[PDB]
Amino acid sequence: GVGTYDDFHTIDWVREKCKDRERHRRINSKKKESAWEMTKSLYDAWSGWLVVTLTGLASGALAGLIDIAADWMTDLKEGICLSALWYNHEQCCWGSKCPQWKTWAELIIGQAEGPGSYIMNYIMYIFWALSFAFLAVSLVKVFAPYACGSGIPEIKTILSGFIIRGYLGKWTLMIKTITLVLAVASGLSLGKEGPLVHVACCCGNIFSYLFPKYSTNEAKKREVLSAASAAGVSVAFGAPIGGVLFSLEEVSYYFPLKTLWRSFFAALVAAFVLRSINPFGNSRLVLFYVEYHTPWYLFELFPFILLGVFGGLWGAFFIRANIAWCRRRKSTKFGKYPVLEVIIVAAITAVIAFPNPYTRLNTSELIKELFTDCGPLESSSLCDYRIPDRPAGVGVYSAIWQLCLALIFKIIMTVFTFGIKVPSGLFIPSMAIGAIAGRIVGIAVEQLAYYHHDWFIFKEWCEVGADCITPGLYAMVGAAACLGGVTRMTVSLVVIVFELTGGLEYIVPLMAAVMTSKWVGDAFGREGIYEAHIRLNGYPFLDAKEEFTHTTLAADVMRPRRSDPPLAVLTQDNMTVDDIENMINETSYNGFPVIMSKESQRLVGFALRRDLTIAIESARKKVCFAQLKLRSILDMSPFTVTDHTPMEIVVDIFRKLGLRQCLVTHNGRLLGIITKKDILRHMA
Amino acid sequence: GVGTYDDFHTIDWVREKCKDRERHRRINSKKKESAWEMTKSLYDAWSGWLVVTLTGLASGALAGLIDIAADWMTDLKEGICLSALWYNHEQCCWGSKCPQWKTWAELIIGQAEGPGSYIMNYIMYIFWALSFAFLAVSLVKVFAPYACGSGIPEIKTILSGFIIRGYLGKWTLMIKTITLVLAVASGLSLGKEGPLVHVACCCGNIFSYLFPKYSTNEAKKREVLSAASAAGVSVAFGAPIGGVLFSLEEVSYYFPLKTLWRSFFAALVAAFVLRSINPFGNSRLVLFYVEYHTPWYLFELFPFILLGVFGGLWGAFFIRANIAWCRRRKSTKFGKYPVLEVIIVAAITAVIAFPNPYTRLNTSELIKELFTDCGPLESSSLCDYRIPDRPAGVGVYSAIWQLCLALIFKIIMTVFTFGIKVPSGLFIPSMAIGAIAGRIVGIAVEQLAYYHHDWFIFKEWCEVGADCITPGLYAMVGAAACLGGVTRMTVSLVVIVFELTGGLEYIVPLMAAVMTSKWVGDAFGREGIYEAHIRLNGYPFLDAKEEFTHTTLAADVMRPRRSDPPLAVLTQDNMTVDDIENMINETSYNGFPVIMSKESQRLVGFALRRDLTIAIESARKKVCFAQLKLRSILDMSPFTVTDHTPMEIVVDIFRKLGLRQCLVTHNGRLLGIITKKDILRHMA
């Protein structure tokens, strides 16, 4: 009861460490009694690894199930396997003019070809997109409203000590899994690689309730959630090291430096399980893994910067636009019709995505297709090729024509499709936009090389009789650049991309593009999409990157100020239960400093509203703060900071010790308070 | 002048960050003036990468020169190349019964063979070992006494805020490089992979003096030294990621999490330069790099854990013996004759090392030879081999006979040879002991398989007609186990070994052996050799691993106590210059809390002894602490901690904020002080 946090309230890390140390000391003291006690001590020491093991296994299994179901449903959106329903397009057209895999054309009209067949299949595609999106949104809105969104901003904030009760519950887990399957299969411009961080964390917290070492403490729960975020990123991208780096850079806030072992173990186990789910012998590390064995020239490092600029522009644009829409979704009647909005967005996406073969094609499959360089047996519109370069024809001319339309559609539709009441991610759509840009640039460069090989730009570098330009590498570079320009990741992202598509040959291009994208995006604000959404949602996230440039001390920020009412303080014996109840029920404060006397104004300690209420209720059912004596709940070591302290030290105290509130005094006299939110309000 | 630290005094991290913020604000304000100011701001922003670049290049070049010179001198200890003096044994016997490479035998006696030849070559080997060791020790003792020892404990401590003035100076760098070349070439049981962490750091600090951003600040110097330690470990083992992990785990103390980029850049550049030094086309990544393409069975994971036990025993034994000797070297007349002690040790090592071919052979070369599994063209005593296994003879029996003697000699002689006045390291000798144990175990297992293949232990796992046991993998496992049992490294060490010897096939055996070694060593004390030597030297190192188990508050530790004289405090106007001078000259304290009046005992601020002295001298050449007015030097935000505070929070303040000293009060009254050393003294 005592020391229980309220909803949407930040965590006093220091008290968590204190009670954890008390538990450790008690366990060690009980250890020496007999063999069972050392056994229990070993069990409690290994609980930190048991939670990570279970979290990794659950994350791997959930990612495998989600991927299988999303593939099957996305393919059900187009046709069905008459021979055996439990197959997708790939399996029903490979495992043997395929007579088994039938689109709705011959099912309904009876003719596989014709304008009527195309119209009816268009209608059926739109209908299935609408049905999937509507079901996902209804299920989220009715069973677990916390399933919406990528949930990386909220997990981030939750690892900064913040609290959101059901956000990582069982029902959020189940509904997020189901609705993520149903949304990635709805044709929306969204992915489930971003959301896989949340659905992974949902596992960890759940498993944290199996062990008293973590259920009864919050800081250790944050350790388990950091490990779970690493496991989630790993199982999403299949990159354990990349996932751990992402956890260090973006998500995790307190890192004792011992959890790196646990984070990497979680990531490794998650990736191992994800690999273990190979029910049909899929050799692809992920649904968008591509390998490269082609060279690049220093000249190509110029366009690889160009994409970096583009990915730096669009990124900023997106963060400049998406929030500008999300605000309008929250500050307008659009926020009262979530289901209608998602149905409208799914209908528009399915209407404008069917005509274009690339937009109609699943975003992760589109990323795979863009990554792979043209093959000899491929005659698709992408590589309709008619000297060191292949000849060109009309087909490659139309390839750019329609790929530009795909790029524009994805850019426009991901702005309106990120924040909506359905599990949506920003990794896959950003990578798709970046990869489309990269493929466009790569085709342009290859065509330039073929038509104008005689120039010294290609005469020396490009070997005669050998194709030198690699469009797939440009697509990968563009994906990395756009992803880093929307999320402002530098090394975590580059390592994620490197593991995502093996090969160290393209570390220089990847670093160049990612760094250029970040340096271009920072010119229009130094906040990534996750930081911008943490800000927009108004979460109490203390960003260490932000600098308290203002030269102001704790004198300015301590509250109450002159205008605000007198500082609320307690006493030792003068007052009674009635007084404390009256001043609690009339005050929204969660904590009261206690002094001896009104005139003395000398600090004694600190007490919390929740602890006071619980203890007072217990006493009433079943006042003397000094030695109704309620000293037990009292805090005799409340952090103080002299008013002359420049606020940088106070912010550093909050960020390092993880306090909720530090008092403020002037030469041994209590004057004000600074909660974890007071500094945030001051920054605004 | 003001705010200058004294010798062997710890660093107030908080003040360093504060003055760094002041400098940042001033530079940013000056930025807007004109183009040159933005140029200067960019220059100061890239200084952090320029220092790391220079440190990495210098570390690579110094490691290359050290390795070349050590090879040449170690080979000069045996013979010379008549055709061209600037060649070692490998080059003078490969680049064409070699007539060029002549040992001293035919040079002096004239006959290459005979008992007299052997005796005189033995005498010359001992003489050259003595000469090299004596020259190294004389040069260290006369030019830079800080060059002695591995210097990893001292660098560690220096990254914890401690200060040692010349320890990373130019002269320590030069003398350490020369004497490390001369000591690794003296036949002593020591290495230069450990010392290269110091030789790298010596570079960084030196380069830190090229830039006001780091010369005038100490915390940023510690960041550069962390990057330099990463670069040093990388250039030593050729493992950038392993070096960065070692810096994170062992050396670095404060990691803002942004220096990881700088640490990895330093490590990468150092390894790149080290590779770039290939004047004779050496394809070996390092002098002891070995590749493996052989399998292992689960059965061998039992002996691979046995070595872990052995490496866990010996490790502890070493940390139970070496310190027990180092104390005796410091608490006895042995400490008054460093040169004589090192000459005696070199003479004994050269006397007992010549007879044994493995002991006579350079420790790094011996590690390389142990790592490589037997080859078809190798007929050495190590693989004197006469069914899935090769037949055996007397030669393999003698191999174990003398390899056990090599193991015993190295174990006994590294205990007496680590701490002595000459640059010595513990990586190579520990790896050599581990690898000798590993080869012993591997040969034993292979012989068991050959003689008793019929047993089901090998009848199933070991394929008929194919050799299954890999002695070289046992050597690697033993090296890793002993290294981790003497240094108590878990993941940094495993990654260092993995990069040092490409191949993920042996990650499971390496983890098993390293973890077993650490868990066995912890049973005999939970401190690595570096921690044990930091303790023995009495450095003020606050080890986060240590737990302040004692349930005592800041009341217990605050000084002065009842017995100690009255707490030293100051006033505002009552006293005069004479009083302050008298109390400074009669007190060894470096800090003085200031209150208003003796009776009020209300805390105002804090003033350091060095600042007081400098300002007082300036005023005398060229008292009113409130608004001789010396408020400017005063600290108006001195950290306080109520006496009821359990010491864990105070230790956490010191470890996170990096304070030197926090005061201690009781209900708004100054009662005591705690320094960074008071908590350490209490722990003892």
Ligand SMILES: Nc1ncnc2c1ncn2[C@@H]1O[C@H](COP(=O)(O)OP(=O)(O)OP(=O)(O)O)[C@@H](O)[C@H]1O
């Ligand atoms: N005892 C007090 N007397 C006066 N002002 C206080 C006292 N305790 C807190 N405050 C101030 O009142 C405001 C509300 O703080 P409060 O304690 O309610 O924060 P919180 O519970 O952490 O936040 P939230 O509003 O999210 O619940 C802040 O300005 C805080 O500084």
Ligand SMILES: Nc1ncnc2c1ncn2[C@@H]1O[C@H](COP(=O)(O)OP(=O)(O)OP(=O)(O)O)[C@@H](O)[C@H]1O
């Ligand atoms: N103003 C003071 N009045 C009384 N005791 C003090 C005062 N300042 C420090 N002390 C105590 O004196 C002892 C040494 O403090 P001091 O300031 O000299 O340490 P230091 O300079 O950091 O250490 P070192 O001895 O390595 O130079 C410690 O017990 C410290 O708590």
Ligand SMILES: [Cl-]
């Ligand atoms: Cl959202």
Ligand SMILES: [Cl-]
């Ligand atoms: Cl997807």
Ligand SMILES: [Cl-]
């Ligand atoms: Cl996301």
Ligand SMILES: [Cl-]
């Ligand atoms: Cl030493």
Ligand SMILES: [Cl-]
């Ligand atoms: Cl060596």
Ligand SMILES: [Cl-]
């Ligand atoms: Cl060492």
